[PDB]
Amino acid sequence: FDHCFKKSSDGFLYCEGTKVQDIMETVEKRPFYLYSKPQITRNLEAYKEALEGVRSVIGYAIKANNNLKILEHLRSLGCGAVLVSGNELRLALLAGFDPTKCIFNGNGKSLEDLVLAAQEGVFVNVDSEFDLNNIVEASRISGKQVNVLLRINPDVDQVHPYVATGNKNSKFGIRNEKLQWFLDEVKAHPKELKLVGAHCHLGSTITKVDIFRDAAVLMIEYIDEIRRQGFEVSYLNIGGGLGIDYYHAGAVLPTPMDLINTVRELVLSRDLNLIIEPGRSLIANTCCFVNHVTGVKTNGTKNFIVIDGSMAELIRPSLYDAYQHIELVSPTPPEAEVTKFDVVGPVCESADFLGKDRELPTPPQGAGLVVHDAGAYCMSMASTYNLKMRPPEYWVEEDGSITKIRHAETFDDHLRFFEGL
Amino acid sequence: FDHCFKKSSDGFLYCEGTKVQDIMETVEKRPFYLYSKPQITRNLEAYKEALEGVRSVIGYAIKANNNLKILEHLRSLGCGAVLVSGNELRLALLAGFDPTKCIFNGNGKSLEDLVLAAQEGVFVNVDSEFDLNNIVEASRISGKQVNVLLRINPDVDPQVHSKFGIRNEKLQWFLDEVKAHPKELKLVGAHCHLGSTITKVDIFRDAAVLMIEYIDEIRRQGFEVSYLNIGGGLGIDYYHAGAVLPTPMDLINTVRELVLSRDLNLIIEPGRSLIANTCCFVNHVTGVKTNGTKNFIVIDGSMAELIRPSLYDAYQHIELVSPTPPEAEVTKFDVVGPVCESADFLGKDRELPTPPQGAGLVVHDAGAYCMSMASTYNLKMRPPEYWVEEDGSITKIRHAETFDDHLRFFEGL
Numbered sequence: 001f002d003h004c005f006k007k008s009s010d011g012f013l014y015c016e017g018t019k020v021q022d023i024m025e026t027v028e029k030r031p032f033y034l035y036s037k038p039q040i041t042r043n044l045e046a047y048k049e050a051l052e053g054v055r056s057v058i059g060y061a062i063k064a065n066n067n068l069k070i071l072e073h074l075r076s077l078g079c080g081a082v083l084v085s086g087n088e089l090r091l092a093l094l095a096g097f098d099p100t101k102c103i104f105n106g107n108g109k110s111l112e113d114l115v116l117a118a119q120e121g122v123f124v125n126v127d128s129e130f131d132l133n134n135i136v137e138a139s140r141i142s143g144k145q146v147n148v149l150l151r152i153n154p155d156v157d158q159v160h161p162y163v164a165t166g167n168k169n170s171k172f173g174i175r176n177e178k179l180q181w182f183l184d185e186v187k188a189h190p191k192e193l194k195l196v197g198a199h200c201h202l203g204s205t206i207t208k209v210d211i212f213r214d215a216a217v218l219m220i221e222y223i224d225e226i227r228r229q230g231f232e233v234s235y236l237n238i239g240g241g242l243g244i245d246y247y248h249a250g251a252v253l254p255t256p257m258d259l260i261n262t263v264r265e266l267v268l269s270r271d272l273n274l275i276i277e278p279g280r281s282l283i284a285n286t287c288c289f290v291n292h293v294t295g296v297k298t299n300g301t302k303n304f305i306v307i308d309g310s311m312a313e314l315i316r317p318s319l320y321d322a323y324q325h326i327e328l329v330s331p332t333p334p335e336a337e338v339t340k341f342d343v344v345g346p347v348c349e350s351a352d353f354l355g356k357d358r359e360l361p362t363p364p365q366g367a368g369l370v371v372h373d374a375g376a377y378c379m380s381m382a383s384t385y386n387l388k389m390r391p392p393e394y395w396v397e398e399d400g401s402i403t404k405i406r407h408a409e410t411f412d413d414h415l416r417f418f419e420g421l
Numbered sequence: 422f423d424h425c426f427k428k429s430s431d432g433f434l435y436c437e438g439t440k441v442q443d444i445m446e447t448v449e450k451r452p453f454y455l456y457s458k459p460q461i462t463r464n465l466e467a468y469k470e471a472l473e474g475v476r477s478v479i480g481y482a483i484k485a486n487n488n489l490k491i492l493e494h495l496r497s498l499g500c501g502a503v504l505v506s507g508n509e510l511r512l513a514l515l516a517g518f519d520p521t522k523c524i525f526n527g528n529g530k531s532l533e534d535l536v537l538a539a540q541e542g543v544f545v546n547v548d549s550e551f552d553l554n555n556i557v558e559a560s561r562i563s564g565k566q567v568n569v570l571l572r573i574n575p576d577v578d579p580q581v582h583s584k585f586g587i588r589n590e591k592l593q594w595f596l597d598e599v600k601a602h603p604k605e606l607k608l609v610g611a612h613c614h615l616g617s618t619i620t621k622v623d624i625f626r627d628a629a630v631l632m633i634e635y636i637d638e639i640r641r642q643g644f645e646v647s648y649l650n651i652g653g654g655l656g657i658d659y660y661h662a663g664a665v666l667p668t669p670m671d672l673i674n675t676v677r678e679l680v681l682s683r684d685l686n687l688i689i690e691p692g693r694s695l696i697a698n699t700c701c702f703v704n705h706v707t708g709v710k711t712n713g714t715k716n717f718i719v720i721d722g723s724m725a726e727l728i729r730p731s732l733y734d735a736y737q738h739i740e741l742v743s744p745t746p747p748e749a750e751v752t753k754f755d756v757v758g759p760v761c762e763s764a765d766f767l768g769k770d771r772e773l774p775t776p777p778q779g780a781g782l783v784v785h786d787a788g789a790y791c792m793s794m795a796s797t798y799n800l801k802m803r804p805p806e807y808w809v810e811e812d813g814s815i816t817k818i819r820h821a822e823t824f825d826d827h828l829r830f831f832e833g834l
């Protein structure tokens with residue numbers, strides 16, 4: 001297993017060379033998210049090495065994790081920013097992203113947000129007829145021409161239905177039979193639009209690189225037709241959606257190299273800039289959600305590890321029936337009875353669980369427990385549900401040092417919303 | 422059909438005689454949750470009326486909605502508070518709630534939260550052996566006796582695996598463990614939780630009948646038991662199909678005479694039934710698109726402000742706020758937000774007229790487990806909250822979250 005979070009022979013969990021027990025003891029006894037900064041570097045360098053010889057933008061999907069320190073680090077390594085909202089663009093500019101490496105996607109881009117997009121000069125995809133009319137009005141208000149990409153549905157349908165974005169009947173991209181309508185409209189707005197490319201995103205947790213190859217071939221047919229109607233196209237955006245190993249049992253998964261190798265010769269043969277939009281595959285595997293065990297109990301013949309963390313800070317398992325690996329931070333006295341636990345949070349409800357049916361040694365009270373691979377769509381999807389206030393974030397750097405990269409939310413951060421009313 | 426949000430003859434949606442269209446013009450052009458403060462009042466008065474002549478606590482789940490102004494209004498009317506965390510307890514005390522009308526539930530009550538619970542004189546429902554030991558240690562740290570209730574398990578489990586019952590083997594152990602800790606624990610009653618949505622009043626009656634036999638035996642064994650906490654909500658008509666639903670009167674009519682015969686104080690938990698149908702999530706239509714077989718109304722609101730339909734497969738009624746132009750196509754729509762995954766939907770297969778851009782659209786019955794679960798996914802910052810008063814006036818009960826709120830987490834880091 002290649003992974004930044006490793007259980008020594010001793011039975012201690014480490015993040016790089018630092019013992020998680022040790023960090024747990026130097027921080028507030030409430031849940032926290034812990035990152036390896038080095039694993040962030042390693043994840044980008046795999047894509048950068050994969051894209052050698054291809055003119056390319058690596059678009060970090062900011063939706064996956066919006067920690068300002070993490071954006072600042074990805075941006076220093078030459079990363080681009082993919083953006084689904086105006087606040088995401090705003091954060092991308094404070095992080096110091098180059099606007100000509102930013103791409104603004106979405107199926108409901110507001111006029112106020114398209115105006116910011118236009119004045120800053122970012123790429124803007126085109127998802128619908130109403131989107132186009134909005135991007136046109138945005139250009140008028142901003143007085144800047146807008147580099148657009150047609151987001152096109154390739155009609156390519158094997159992934160959780162809540163993260164399937166390329167399929168027939170998703171809310172994403174234009175109709176295929178209506179491509180000509182978009183090309184005619186763009187040519188009718190030479191002041192306001194400059195068509196520079198085609199965009200697709202197929203979904204998330206994809207583990208089958210064939211679907212990227214089959215997609216890229218359909219996208220090159222459309223770029224070839226667009227080029228022949230006299231449009232100057234520089235860019236193909238195949239998006240993100242590359243999966244990672246959530247199961248921690250040595251599974252061999254498609255690398256960034258495997259993914260680029262499927263479209264390398266087709267892209268090079270058309271002298272296209274490739275835009276990739278990885279979120280999960282850049283950030284997910286760099287991070288544990290660190291909990292304390294509260295107690296252990298039994299309803300009839302299921303068994304329960306009750307932890308301080310919950311669906312408030314980490315909703316992915318409940319929301320998608322997703323597996324994230326669970327294991328203890330410190331070694332157990334070996335007279336404990338290894339049996340099958342459901343791992344649940346302090347909220348009394350059936351959706352408040354972080355994993356089901358997990359063979360583990362019975363933990364003592366106050367024992368560290370982690371959920372692995374919680375760098376993506378975990379903190380970013382977090383609520384204050386049951387007033388479990390959002391956790392702090394720490395990372396481990398090259399030198400073995402521990403730095404807080406996000407203040408913990410307090411109960412006072414809830415009262416701020418009612419001051420003076 | 423009967424509701425605080427009604428379409429009139431003029432084809433406009435009203436909230437206690439105020440047009441939602443005129444409210445939308447007063448507030449910022451972004452999604453917002455809108456409540457009828459009077460429907461909150463009616464819903465509570467219905468329980469209060471059903472509980473008259475019965476010693477009782479109407480226990481409101483702060484879990485379902487933790488707006489301070491709404492907590493203070495429910496407290497002003499004699500409402501109790503059901504708590505699942507330290508912070509919810511801190512907030513019940515701020516909102517002026519009576520600690521003799523607070524109960525603290527949960528499978529993971531931290532030691533530190535129980536200390537606060539013990540200092541403040543709130544009831545504690547006991548979940549497990551590790552919960553009891555936690556409670557005793559909370560007593561020794563606080564220096565305060567903790568009033569506790571023991572679990573009773575009814576017949577509800579659809580799964581199928583001393584003088585009580587085959588499903589209540591451990592209760593005697595719990596009584597003896599409580600008797601062994603007199604300075605630290607005082608048993609004051611018995612709790613149990615039924616299905617999330619009670620449809621049949623008979624399931625309440627039967628749970629009550631069972632727990633009264635247990636409390637009789639608990640009283641025979643030398644304990645001073647005063648309280649019966651039967652947690653369970655009545656159903657909400659989420660389809661506005663005008664269905665058959667039992668009223669609070671019908672429910673409490675089933676236990677009234679047995680509870681009076683024993684002089685028990687009945688703690689009911691109607692949190693959902695109290696706030697759910699008082700509230701609309703109000704949106705602006707961004708635009709209408711189509712992909713193959715499906716049509717979409719795209720709104721400004723999202724799974725970031727309202728995850729319930731995505732997370733629980735949940736139907737909530739949707740309709741436009743104002744009349745449509747005559748030419749507008751009536752046709753099936755999914756209603757979706759702008760967040761970049763297919764989980765971001767508020768409703769599916771909804772026969773609506775085709776809204777113009779900027780048109781008001783509501784998701785109904787967004788009172789419970791909606792704002793309380795809001796996130797900042799896609800940095801969609803959390804919406805402000807408004808209510809209509811008795812007089813028809815519009816008052817803000819929560820400030821909108823701003824981007825600088827996200828930025829404050831990184832200050833000096």
Ligand SMILES: Cc1ncc(COP(=O)(O)O)c(C[NH2+]CCCC[C@H](N)C(=O)O)c1O
Nearest residue numbers: 061201204240241277278279280377761762
């Ligand atoms: C247009 C667009 N580009 C890139 C991405 C990033 O995808 P990934 O992180 O590389 O997989 C997206 C993302 N979209 C939706 C996926 C939701 C995931 C869900 N919260 C989960 O399973 O946790 C995109 O839309």
